[PDB]
PDB file of C-alpha atoms and ligand atoms in Angstrom:
ATOM      1  CA  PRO A  15      22.746 -27.558 -21.567  1.00 26.13           C
ATOM      2  CA  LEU A  16      21.490 -24.229 -20.133  1.00 29.81           C
ATOM      3  CA  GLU A  17      24.779 -22.338 -20.621  1.00 30.20           C
ATOM      4  CA  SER A  18      24.400 -23.103 -24.322  1.00 30.42           C
ATOM      5  CA  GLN A  19      20.774 -22.116 -25.116  1.00 31.33           C
ATOM      6  CA  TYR A  20      20.701 -18.761 -23.295  1.00 31.13           C
ATOM      7  CA  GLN A  21      22.859 -15.671 -23.153  1.00 33.44           C
ATOM      8  CA  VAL A  22      22.952 -14.717 -19.442  1.00 31.44           C
ATOM      9  CA  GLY A  23      23.048 -11.102 -18.346  1.00 30.41           C
ATOM     10  CA  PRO A  24      23.150  -9.221 -15.052  1.00 27.54           C
ATOM     11  CA  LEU A  25      20.931  -9.585 -12.037  1.00 29.01           C
ATOM     12  CA  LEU A  26      17.297  -8.522 -12.485  1.00 29.44           C
ATOM     13  CA  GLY A  27      14.424  -7.330 -10.305  1.00 34.59           C
ATOM     14  CA  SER A  28      14.080  -4.810  -7.503  1.00 32.10           C
ATOM     15  CA  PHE A  29      16.410  -9.437  -3.453  1.00 31.73           C
ATOM     16  CA  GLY A  30      16.366 -12.844  -5.156  1.00 35.24           C
ATOM     17  CA  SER A  31      18.388 -14.571  -7.897  1.00 38.14           C
ATOM     18  CA  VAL A  32      16.758 -13.675 -11.232  1.00 39.54           C
ATOM     19  CA  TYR A  33      19.015 -12.715 -14.111  1.00 40.07           C
ATOM     20  CA  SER A  34      18.248 -11.041 -17.407  1.00 39.73           C
ATOM     21  CA  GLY A  35      18.736 -13.278 -20.398  1.00 40.00           C
ATOM     22  CA  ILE A  36      18.086 -13.818 -24.075  1.00 35.73           C
ATOM     23  CA  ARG A  37      17.237 -17.162 -25.693  1.00 32.57           C
ATOM     24  CA  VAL A  38      19.903 -17.727 -28.352  1.00 32.84           C
ATOM     25  CA  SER A  39      17.491 -19.740 -30.522  1.00 33.13           C
ATOM     26  CA  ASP A  40      15.551 -16.567 -31.318  1.00 36.36           C
ATOM     27  CA  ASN A  41      16.827 -13.632 -29.160  1.00 36.55           C
ATOM     28  CA  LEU A  42      13.660 -13.878 -27.080  1.00 36.36           C
ATOM     29  CA  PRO A  43      14.118 -11.983 -23.779  1.00 37.06           C
ATOM     30  CA  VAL A  44      13.881 -14.268 -20.751  1.00 40.24           C
ATOM     31  CA  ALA A  45      14.237 -14.126 -16.998  1.00 38.64           C
ATOM     32  CA  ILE A  46      16.542 -16.787 -15.520  1.00 40.33           C
ATOM     33  CA  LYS A  47      15.448 -17.655 -11.984  1.00 42.81           C
ATOM     34  CA  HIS A  48      17.617 -19.804  -9.700  1.00 40.69           C
ATOM     35  CA  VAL A  49      16.179 -21.644  -6.731  1.00 39.35           C
ATOM     36  CA  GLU A  50      18.485 -23.246  -4.217  1.00 41.73           C
ATOM     37  CA  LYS A  51      17.397 -26.807  -3.300  1.00 44.54           C
ATOM     38  CA  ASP A  52      18.300 -26.400   0.388  1.00 44.51           C
ATOM     39  CA  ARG A  53      15.927 -23.439   0.523  1.00 41.91           C
ATOM     40  CA  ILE A  54      12.827 -25.109  -1.031  1.00 39.66           C
ATOM     41  CA  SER A  55       9.782 -25.364   1.237  1.00 39.10           C
ATOM     42  CA  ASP A  56       7.273 -27.463  -0.755  1.00 40.70           C
ATOM     43  CA  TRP A  57       8.228 -30.189  -3.252  1.00 40.76           C
ATOM     44  CA  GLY A  58       6.058 -31.682  -5.974  1.00 40.89           C
ATOM     45  CA  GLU A  59       6.289 -34.640  -8.306  1.00 43.38           C
ATOM     46  CA  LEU A  60       5.954 -34.122 -12.040  1.00 43.96           C
ATOM     47  CA  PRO A  61       3.986 -36.514 -14.257  1.00 47.33           C
ATOM     48  CA  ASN A  62       7.174 -38.566 -14.755  1.00 46.09           C
ATOM     49  CA  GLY A  63       7.569 -38.837 -10.973  1.00 47.52           C
ATOM     50  CA  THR A  64      10.535 -36.484 -11.040  1.00 47.44           C
ATOM     51  CA  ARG A  65      10.731 -34.474  -7.836  1.00 45.96           C
ATOM     52  CA  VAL A  66      10.683 -30.708  -8.549  1.00 42.12           C
ATOM     53  CA  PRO A  67       9.910 -27.557  -6.573  1.00 43.87           C
ATOM     54  CA  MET A  68       6.206 -26.980  -6.209  1.00 43.31           C
ATOM     55  CA  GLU A  69       6.813 -23.647  -7.987  1.00 38.06           C
ATOM     56  CA  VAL A  70       7.611 -25.606 -11.183  1.00 36.14           C
ATOM     57  CA  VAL A  71       4.459 -27.738 -10.766  1.00 32.33           C
ATOM     58  CA  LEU A  72       2.289 -24.690 -10.395  1.00 31.08           C
ATOM     59  CA  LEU A  73       3.888 -22.762 -13.293  1.00 31.10           C
ATOM     60  CA  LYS A  74       3.418 -25.735 -15.587  1.00 27.74           C
ATOM     61  CA  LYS A  75      -0.283 -25.936 -14.617  1.00 26.78           C
ATOM     62  CA  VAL A  76      -0.946 -22.226 -15.439  1.00 27.67           C
ATOM     63  CA  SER A  77       1.365 -22.011 -18.523  1.00 30.53           C
ATOM     64  CA  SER A  78      -1.400 -22.415 -21.107  1.00 31.03           C
ATOM     65  CA  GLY A  79      -1.036 -19.179 -23.034  1.00 32.54           C
ATOM     66  CA  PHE A  80      -3.294 -16.766 -21.202  1.00 36.29           C
ATOM     67  CA  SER A  81      -1.096 -13.718 -21.044  1.00 40.51           C
ATOM     68  CA  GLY A  82      -2.011 -12.644 -17.506  1.00 37.76           C
ATOM     69  CA  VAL A  83       0.278 -15.083 -15.683  1.00 39.67           C
ATOM     70  CA  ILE A  84       4.037 -15.390 -16.212  1.00 39.69           C
ATOM     71  CA  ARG A  85       4.909 -18.215 -18.598  1.00 41.74           C
ATOM     72  CA  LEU A  86       7.510 -20.849 -17.684  1.00 43.26           C
ATOM     73  CA  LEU A  87       9.370 -21.644 -20.925  1.00 41.73           C
ATOM     74  CA  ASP A  88      11.764 -24.306 -19.639  1.00 40.04           C
ATOM     75  CA  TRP A  89      13.528 -25.508 -16.518  1.00 39.90           C
ATOM     76  CA  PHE A  90      16.700 -27.413 -15.589  1.00 39.30           C
ATOM     77  CA  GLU A  91      17.899 -29.331 -12.571  1.00 41.08           C
ATOM     78  CA  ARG A  92      21.411 -28.786 -11.219  1.00 43.62           C
ATOM     79  CA  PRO A  93      23.180 -30.537  -8.257  1.00 41.62           C
ATOM     80  CA  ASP A  94      22.223 -27.856  -5.711  1.00 41.64           C
ATOM     81  CA  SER A  95      19.514 -25.867  -7.517  1.00 40.55           C
ATOM     82  CA  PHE A  96      16.784 -25.604 -10.072  1.00 40.55           C
ATOM     83  CA  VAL A  97      16.824 -23.022 -12.960  1.00 36.18           C
ATOM     84  CA  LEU A  98      13.546 -21.647 -14.321  1.00 36.02           C
ATOM     85  CA  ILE A  99      13.401 -19.970 -17.697  1.00 37.88           C
ATOM     86  CA  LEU A 100      10.579 -17.438 -17.591  1.00 37.53           C
ATOM     87  CA  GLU A 101       9.236 -15.055 -20.212  1.00 40.12           C
ATOM     88  CA  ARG A 102      10.490 -11.498 -19.820  1.00 39.44           C
ATOM     89  CA  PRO A 103       8.217  -8.719 -21.112  1.00 40.00           C
ATOM     90  CA  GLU A 104       9.950  -5.509 -22.050  1.00 38.14           C
ATOM     91  CA  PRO A 105       9.595  -2.739 -21.335  1.00 39.74           C
ATOM     92  CA  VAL A 106       8.254  -3.568 -17.869  1.00 39.07           C
ATOM     93  CA  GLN A 107       7.988  -2.064 -14.414  1.00 39.42           C
ATOM     94  CA  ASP A 108       6.618  -3.869 -11.367  1.00 37.33           C
ATOM     95  CA  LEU A 109       3.473  -2.446  -9.872  1.00 40.28           C
ATOM     96  CA  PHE A 110       5.206  -1.638  -6.553  1.00 37.89           C
ATOM     97  CA  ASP A 111       7.649   0.742  -8.243  1.00 36.63           C
ATOM     98  CA  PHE A 112       4.879   2.118 -10.483  1.00 37.00           C
ATOM     99  CA  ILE A 113       2.747   3.069  -7.451  1.00 37.59           C
ATOM    100  CA  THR A 114       5.808   4.502  -5.652  1.00 36.48           C
ATOM    101  CA  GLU A 115       6.583   6.766  -8.552  1.00 33.41           C
ATOM    102  CA  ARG A 116       3.062   7.809  -9.481  1.00 31.39           C
ATOM    103  CA  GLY A 117       1.397   7.822  -6.039  1.00 33.07           C
ATOM    104  CA  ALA A 118      -2.280   6.874  -5.651  1.00 31.67           C
ATOM    105  CA  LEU A 119      -3.655   5.746  -9.026  1.00 29.12           C
ATOM    106  CA  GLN A 120      -6.629   7.279 -10.761  1.00 27.38           C
ATOM    107  CA  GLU A 121      -9.568   4.991 -10.269  1.00 27.79           C
ATOM    108  CA  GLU A 122      -9.969   4.374 -14.016  1.00 31.36           C
ATOM    109  CA  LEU A 123      -6.423   3.038 -14.055  1.00 30.11           C
ATOM    110  CA  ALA A 124      -6.797   1.076 -10.771  1.00 28.66           C
ATOM    111  CA  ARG A 125      -9.967  -0.457 -12.207  1.00 27.99           C
ATOM    112  CA  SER A 126      -8.151  -1.624 -15.375  1.00 28.53           C
ATOM    113  CA  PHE A 127      -5.224  -3.064 -13.368  1.00 26.63           C
ATOM    114  CA  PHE A 128      -7.456  -4.687 -10.715  1.00 27.67           C
ATOM    115  CA  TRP A 129      -9.648  -6.255 -13.355  1.00 28.98           C
ATOM    116  CA  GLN A 130      -6.605  -7.830 -15.072  1.00 28.68           C
ATOM    117  CA  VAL A 131      -5.342  -9.192 -11.769  1.00 28.58           C
ATOM    118  CA  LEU A 132      -8.745 -10.713 -11.089  1.00 28.58           C
ATOM    119  CA  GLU A 133      -8.743 -12.389 -14.508  1.00 24.79           C
ATOM    120  CA  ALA A 134      -5.230 -13.694 -13.874  1.00 29.20           C
ATOM    121  CA  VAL A 135      -6.097 -15.038 -10.430  1.00 30.17           C
ATOM    122  CA  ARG A 136      -9.267 -16.704 -11.845  1.00 30.88           C
ATOM    123  CA  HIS A 137      -7.057 -18.397 -14.442  1.00 30.41           C
ATOM    124  CA  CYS A 138      -4.764 -19.745 -11.669  1.00 29.19           C
ATOM    125  CA  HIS A 139      -7.740 -21.087  -9.727  1.00 30.76           C
ATOM    126  CA  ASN A 140      -9.241 -22.650 -12.830  1.00 31.01           C
ATOM    127  CA  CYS A 141      -5.931 -24.392 -13.400  1.00 31.47           C
ATOM    128  CA  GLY A 142      -5.840 -25.712  -9.817  1.00 27.09           C
ATOM    129  CA  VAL A 143      -3.248 -23.235  -8.490  1.00 24.82           C
ATOM    130  CA  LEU A 144      -3.423 -20.872  -5.481  1.00 24.59           C
ATOM    131  CA  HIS A 145      -0.837 -18.114  -5.709  1.00 30.28           C
ATOM    132  CA  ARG A 146      -0.840 -17.121  -1.958  1.00 28.93           C
ATOM    133  CA  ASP A 147       1.347 -14.000  -2.487  1.00 30.48           C
ATOM    134  CA  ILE A 148      -0.731 -11.528  -4.457  1.00 29.79           C
ATOM    135  CA  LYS A 149       0.851  -8.085  -3.951  1.00 29.06           C
ATOM    136  CA  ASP A 150       2.022  -5.189  -6.073  1.00 28.48           C
ATOM    137  CA  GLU A 151       5.603  -6.516  -5.896  1.00 30.84           C
ATOM    138  CA  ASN A 152       4.482  -9.667  -7.717  1.00 29.87           C
ATOM    139  CA  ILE A 153       2.724  -7.890 -10.582  1.00 31.07           C
ATOM    140  CA  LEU A 154       4.541  -6.720 -13.732  1.00 29.40           C
ATOM    141  CA  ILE A 155       3.224  -4.027 -16.054  1.00 30.59           C
ATOM    142  CA  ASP A 156       3.943  -4.366 -19.788  1.00 29.16           C
ATOM    143  CA  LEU A 157       4.211  -0.621 -20.382  1.00 28.50           C
ATOM    144  CA  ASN A 158       3.602  -0.891 -24.127  1.00 28.34           C
ATOM    145  CA  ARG A 159       0.714  -3.333 -24.172  1.00 24.53           C
ATOM    146  CA  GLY A 160      -1.057  -2.234 -20.973  1.00 26.21           C
ATOM    147  CA  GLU A 161      -1.040  -5.871 -19.833  1.00 25.44           C
ATOM    148  CA  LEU A 162      -0.340  -7.028 -16.252  1.00 26.09           C
ATOM    149  CA  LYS A 163       1.399 -10.291 -15.424  1.00 25.25           C
ATOM    150  CA  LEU A 164       1.289 -12.173 -12.119  1.00 26.78           C
ATOM    151  CA  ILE A 165       4.753 -13.463 -11.170  1.00 26.88           C
ATOM    152  CA  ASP A 166       6.583 -15.422  -8.433  1.00 31.16           C
ATOM    153  CA  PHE A 167       4.703 -18.599  -7.671  1.00 32.54           C
ATOM    154  CA  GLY A 168       7.311 -19.445  -5.003  1.00 31.10           C
ATOM    155  CA  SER A 169       4.760 -19.249  -2.187  1.00 28.82           C
ATOM    156  CA  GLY A 170       1.937 -21.024  -4.022  1.00 28.08           C
ATOM    157  CA  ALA A 171       0.119 -24.258  -3.469  1.00 29.62           C
ATOM    158  CA  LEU A 172      -2.239 -26.614  -5.241  1.00 29.93           C
ATOM    159  CA  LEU A 173      -5.733 -25.144  -4.822  1.00 27.92           C
ATOM    160  CA  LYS A 174      -7.894 -27.155  -2.397  1.00 29.58           C
ATOM    161  CA  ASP A 175     -11.220 -26.548  -0.681  1.00 29.68           C
ATOM    162  CA  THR A 176     -10.106 -27.738   2.766  1.00 25.99           C
ATOM    163  CA  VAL A 177      -8.249 -25.675   5.359  1.00 30.28           C
ATOM    164  CA  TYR A 178      -4.706 -24.446   4.897  1.00 31.05           C
ATOM    165  CA  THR A 179      -2.550 -24.463   8.026  1.00 31.17           C
ATOM    166  CA  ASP A 180       0.717 -23.366   6.399  1.00 34.28           C
ATOM    167  CA  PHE A 181       1.656 -20.036   4.798  1.00 33.33           C
ATOM    168  CA  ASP A 182       4.760 -18.397   3.483  1.00 29.68           C
ATOM    169  CA  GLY A 183       3.467 -15.400   1.529  1.00 33.25           C
ATOM    170  CA  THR A 184       3.578 -11.734   2.695  1.00 30.36           C
ATOM    171  CA  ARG A 185       2.217 -11.155   6.186  1.00 28.84           C
ATOM    172  CA  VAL A 186       0.888  -7.615   5.582  1.00 29.21           C
ATOM    173  CA  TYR A 187      -1.293  -9.091   2.787  1.00 27.56           C
ATOM    174  CA  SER A 188      -2.410 -12.055   4.856  1.00 26.93           C
ATOM    175  CA  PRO A 189      -5.896 -12.302   6.319  1.00 29.39           C
ATOM    176  CA  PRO A 190      -6.930 -11.962   9.978  1.00 29.38           C
ATOM    177  CA  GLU A 191      -7.846 -15.647  10.294  1.00 32.38           C
ATOM    178  CA  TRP A 192      -4.194 -16.469   9.508  1.00 34.85           C
ATOM    179  CA  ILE A 193      -2.980 -13.837  12.037  1.00 34.43           C
ATOM    180  CA  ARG A 194      -5.374 -15.032  14.709  1.00 36.51           C
ATOM    181  CA  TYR A 195      -5.712 -18.736  14.181  1.00 39.33           C
ATOM    182  CA  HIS A 196      -2.961 -19.908  11.733  1.00 39.61           C
ATOM    183  CA  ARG A 197      -5.600 -21.207   9.263  1.00 41.45           C
ATOM    184  CA  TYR A 198      -7.434 -20.004   6.198  1.00 41.84           C
ATOM    185  CA  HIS A 199      -9.263 -21.159   3.095  1.00 40.88           C
ATOM    186  CA  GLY A 200      -7.689 -20.397  -0.228  1.00 40.52           C
ATOM    187  CA  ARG A 201     -10.268 -18.350  -2.116  1.00 39.54           C
ATOM    188  CA  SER A 202     -11.363 -16.076   0.726  1.00 38.59           C
ATOM    189  CA  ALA A 203      -7.734 -15.476   1.695  1.00 37.18           C
ATOM    190  CA  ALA A 204      -6.967 -14.512  -1.902  1.00 34.70           C
ATOM    191  CA  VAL A 205      -9.924 -12.068  -1.848  1.00 33.08           C
ATOM    192  CA  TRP A 206      -8.496 -10.534   1.328  1.00 32.31           C
ATOM    193  CA  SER A 207      -5.145  -9.964  -0.344  1.00 33.33           C
ATOM    194  CA  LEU A 208      -6.947  -8.461  -3.330  1.00 36.14           C
ATOM    195  CA  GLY A 209      -8.660  -6.022  -1.012  1.00 34.78           C
ATOM    196  CA  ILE A 210      -5.198  -4.971   0.287  1.00 36.77           C
ATOM    197  CA  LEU A 211      -3.957  -4.618  -3.296  1.00 34.35           C
ATOM    198  CA  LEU A 212      -6.907  -2.450  -4.365  1.00 31.27           C
ATOM    199  CA  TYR A 213      -6.516  -0.142  -1.393  1.00 29.88           C
ATOM    200  CA  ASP A 214      -2.748   0.016  -2.279  1.00 26.72           C
ATOM    201  CA  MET A 215      -3.613   1.139  -5.806  1.00 27.42           C
ATOM    202  CA  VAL A 216      -6.143   3.862  -4.971  1.00 25.42           C
ATOM    203  CA  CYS A 217      -4.427   5.131  -1.842  1.00 25.89           C
ATOM    204  CA  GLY A 218      -0.781   4.729  -2.822  1.00 23.35           C
ATOM    205  CA  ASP A 219       0.205   2.300  -0.063  1.00 20.61           C
ATOM    206  CA  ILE A 220      -1.228  -0.708   1.805  1.00 23.95           C
ATOM    207  CA  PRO A 221      -3.684  -0.013   4.656  1.00 22.22           C
ATOM    208  CA  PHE A 222      -2.124  -2.226   7.356  1.00 21.60           C
ATOM    209  CA  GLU A 223       1.431  -2.649   8.657  1.00 23.24           C
ATOM    210  CA  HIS A 224       0.817  -4.335  12.026  1.00 22.11           C
ATOM    211  CA  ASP A 225      -1.049  -7.471  13.124  1.00 22.46           C
ATOM    212  CA  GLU A 226      -3.332  -5.355  15.323  1.00 23.23           C
ATOM    213  CA  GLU A 227      -4.465  -3.324  12.281  1.00 24.84           C
ATOM    214  CA  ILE A 228      -5.033  -6.507  10.224  1.00 22.80           C
ATOM    215  CA  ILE A 229      -7.384  -7.983  12.844  1.00 21.97           C
ATOM    216  CA  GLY A 230      -8.893  -4.680  13.969  1.00 23.52           C
ATOM    217  CA  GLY A 231     -11.489  -4.362  11.214  1.00 25.77           C
ATOM    218  CA  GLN A 232     -11.135  -0.600  10.506  1.00 29.33           C
ATOM    219  CA  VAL A 233     -10.260   0.798   7.080  1.00 30.01           C
ATOM    220  CA  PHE A 234      -9.239   4.451   7.011  1.00 30.30           C
ATOM    221  CA  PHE A 235      -8.960   6.096   3.577  1.00 30.73           C
ATOM    222  CA  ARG A 236      -6.018   8.441   3.356  1.00 31.54           C
ATOM    223  CA  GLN A 237      -6.871   9.591  -0.176  1.00 29.80           C
ATOM    224  CA  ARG A 238     -10.086  10.643  -1.918  1.00 32.74           C
ATOM    225  CA  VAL A 239     -11.716   7.371  -3.009  1.00 32.73           C
ATOM    226  CA  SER A 240     -15.201   6.987  -4.431  1.00 31.06           C
ATOM    227  CA  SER A 241     -17.911   5.493  -2.330  1.00 30.38           C
ATOM    228  CA  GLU A 242     -18.288   2.536  -4.683  1.00 29.69           C
ATOM    229  CA  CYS A 243     -14.534   1.759  -4.538  1.00 31.00           C
ATOM    230  CA  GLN A 244     -14.507   2.130  -0.719  1.00 31.46           C
ATOM    231  CA  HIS A 245     -17.446  -0.321  -0.482  1.00 31.44           C
ATOM    232  CA  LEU A 246     -15.716  -2.908  -2.621  1.00 32.56           C
ATOM    233  CA  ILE A 247     -12.457  -2.648  -0.594  1.00 31.97           C
ATOM    234  CA  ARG A 248     -14.282  -2.872   2.719  1.00 31.10           C
ATOM    235  CA  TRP A 249     -16.146  -5.940   1.398  1.00 30.94           C
ATOM    236  CA  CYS A 250     -12.951  -7.702   0.371  1.00 34.29           C
ATOM    237  CA  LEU A 251     -11.554  -6.803   3.787  1.00 32.89           C
ATOM    238  CA  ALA A 252     -14.497  -8.301   5.731  1.00 32.90           C
ATOM    239  CA  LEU A 253     -13.165  -9.755   8.957  1.00 31.33           C
ATOM    240  CA  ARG A 254     -15.165 -12.974   8.651  1.00 31.25           C
ATOM    241  CA  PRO A 255     -14.045 -14.977   5.559  1.00 29.56           C
ATOM    242  CA  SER A 256     -17.604 -16.024   4.681  1.00 32.16           C
ATOM    243  CA  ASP A 257     -18.581 -12.309   4.487  1.00 28.51           C
ATOM    244  CA  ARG A 258     -16.071 -11.630   1.706  1.00 28.91           C
ATOM    245  CA  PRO A 259     -17.279 -11.497  -1.969  1.00 33.39           C
ATOM    246  CA  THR A 260     -16.696 -14.303  -4.401  1.00 29.03           C
ATOM    247  CA  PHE A 261     -14.679 -13.461  -7.491  1.00 27.12           C
ATOM    248  CA  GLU A 262     -17.968 -13.239  -9.451  1.00 26.26           C
ATOM    249  CA  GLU A 263     -19.376 -10.729  -6.919  1.00 28.44           C
ATOM    250  CA  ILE A 264     -16.229  -8.626  -7.165  1.00 28.98           C
ATOM    251  CA  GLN A 265     -16.396  -8.439 -10.937  1.00 27.44           C
ATOM    252  CA  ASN A 266     -20.173  -7.743 -10.860  1.00 25.52           C
ATOM    253  CA  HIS A 267     -19.628  -4.908  -8.353  1.00 27.52           C
ATOM    254  CA  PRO A 268     -20.725  -1.453  -9.571  1.00 28.71           C
ATOM    255  CA  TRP A 269     -17.154  -0.057  -9.263  1.00 26.81           C
ATOM    256  CA  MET A 270     -15.838  -2.648 -11.724  1.00 28.46           C
ATOM    257  CA  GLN A 271     -18.142  -1.809 -14.590  1.00 27.09           C
ATOM    258  CA  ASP A 272     -16.908  -0.335 -17.931  1.00 25.88           C
ATOM    259  CA  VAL A 273     -13.258  -1.431 -17.583  1.00 25.85           C
ATOM    260  CA  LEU A 274     -10.709  -0.219 -20.122  1.00 28.02           C
ATOM    261  CA  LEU A 275      -9.134  -2.567 -22.616  1.00 30.84           C
ATOM    262  CA  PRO A 276      -5.379  -3.176 -22.095  1.00 29.65           C
ATOM    263  CA  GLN A 277      -4.521  -1.181 -25.207  1.00 30.74           C
ATOM    264  CA  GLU A 278      -6.728   1.735 -24.124  1.00 31.72           C
ATOM    265  CA  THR A 279      -5.034   1.593 -20.708  1.00 28.62           C
ATOM    266  CA  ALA A 280      -1.619   1.825 -22.322  1.00 29.90           C
ATOM    267  CA  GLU A 281      -2.587   4.728 -24.568  1.00 29.78           C
ATOM    268  CA  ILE A 282      -4.409   6.721 -21.916  1.00 28.00           C
ATOM    269  CA  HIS A 283      -2.253   6.066 -18.822  1.00 26.44           C
ATOM    270  CA  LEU A 284       1.139   4.560 -19.871  1.00 28.23           C
ATOM    271  CA  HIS A 285       2.383   6.232 -23.075  1.00 32.01           C
TER     272      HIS A 285
ATOM    273  CA  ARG B  24       5.194   8.381   5.365  1.00 32.32           C
ATOM    274  CA  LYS B  25       7.515   5.455   4.590  1.00 32.57           C
ATOM    275  CA  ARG B  26       6.350   3.036   1.921  1.00 37.00           C
ATOM    276  CA  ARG B  27       8.337  -0.173   1.811  1.00 38.50           C
ATOM    277  CA  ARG B  28       8.488  -3.632   0.305  1.00 36.09           C
ATOM    278  CA  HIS B  29       7.776  -6.635   2.544  1.00 39.32           C
ATOM    279  CA  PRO B  30       9.726  -9.926   2.166  1.00 36.76           C
ATOM    280  CA  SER B  31       7.760 -13.173   1.775  1.00 37.96           C
TER     281      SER B  31
HETATM  282  O1  AY3 C 305      11.918  -8.632 -16.337  1.00 39.90           O
HETATM  283  C1  AY3 C 305      11.631  -8.353 -15.194  1.00 39.90           C
HETATM  284  N1  AY3 C 305      11.684  -7.183 -14.573  1.00 39.90           N
HETATM  285  C2  AY3 C 305      11.317  -7.247 -13.228  1.00 39.90           C
HETATM  286  C3  AY3 C 305      11.205  -6.222 -12.280  1.00 39.90           C
HETATM  287  C4  AY3 C 305      10.796  -6.538 -11.010  1.00 39.90           C
HETATM  288  C5  AY3 C 305      10.431  -7.839 -10.681  1.00 39.90           C
HETATM  289  C6  AY3 C 305      10.518  -8.844 -11.618  1.00 39.90           C
HETATM  290  C7  AY3 C 305      10.947  -8.567 -12.932  1.00 39.90           C
HETATM  291  C8  AY3 C 305      11.173  -9.390 -14.124  1.00 39.90           C
HETATM  292  C9  AY3 C 305      11.010 -10.663 -14.407  1.00 39.90           C
HETATM  293  C10 AY3 C 305      10.593 -11.764 -13.500  1.00 39.90           C
HETATM  294  C11 AY3 C 305       9.594 -12.603 -13.955  1.00 39.90           C
HETATM  295  C12 AY3 C 305       9.135 -13.647 -13.144  1.00 39.90           C
HETATM  296  C13 AY3 C 305       9.614 -13.815 -11.887  1.00 39.90           C
HETATM  297  C14 AY3 C 305       9.112 -14.906 -11.040  1.00 39.90           C
HETATM  298  O2  AY3 C 305       8.225 -15.625 -11.444  1.00 39.90           O
HETATM  299  O3  AY3 C 305       9.612 -15.001  -9.837  1.00 39.90           O
HETATM  300  C15 AY3 C 305      10.652 -12.998 -11.453  1.00 39.90           C
HETATM  301  C16 AY3 C 305      11.132 -11.978 -12.256  1.00 39.90           C
END
């Protein structure tokens, strides 16, 4: 019984149905996420053949213990819904609100955050999972540990090397081949969204709001940004997918060198 | 200028 193991609190987040909670067994803070069956896009089968939302399949595949992706602790099926018990770091703030309040981030801080997101996305891919909705809204900052967590696998898919023709992530983070042709490959689409995210961090908001900007191929910098950072962003935002860097090329890029540790990041920029 | 969230 779910009503027995957890103390449920008020709504959580910053739209959706995620509630604050505490696990009674040990007062562990949790996030209790409800997903209505009639609203589920993709379904998956578990090992025992039980039909679950794909989000549960993907969360189980990444739930090893690497701290950069949100951990699914448990889940329950109800007549009309599924309930996901997720870890809840505290104190946290999502990266969207963090950037809103602080404006464009110092490049040392953006480098630390971007590096952690890259490591989290690599973990997903290594576990066979494509997130498909990388954006600042889906990134939580543990303000005491300086550790970022990727959340909300509700738009994700199993990672494959063939073409994707479906998409339900965030359009202003989606790549021009999706806008133009309704198709994309997983890794190069992820790199595009990471380019959007990095611009967001160093400029204080995303570069594109309209389809014509997404496909237009021009990146205007509204804030002072180093030449090395600009180059990496423009490379991630290459119009042709095959022109975009691999994850290895991103992390070997000159702008990415000498990253801060999470604890250094917390002490320098968050405390 | 207006910064906003974007639904999925
Ligand atoms: O404790 C929390 N504070 C938050 C603030 C903004 C967004 C999310 C959270 C949050 C937890 C959370 C964690 C995971 C998900 C998810 O996988 O969909 C959703 C919400």
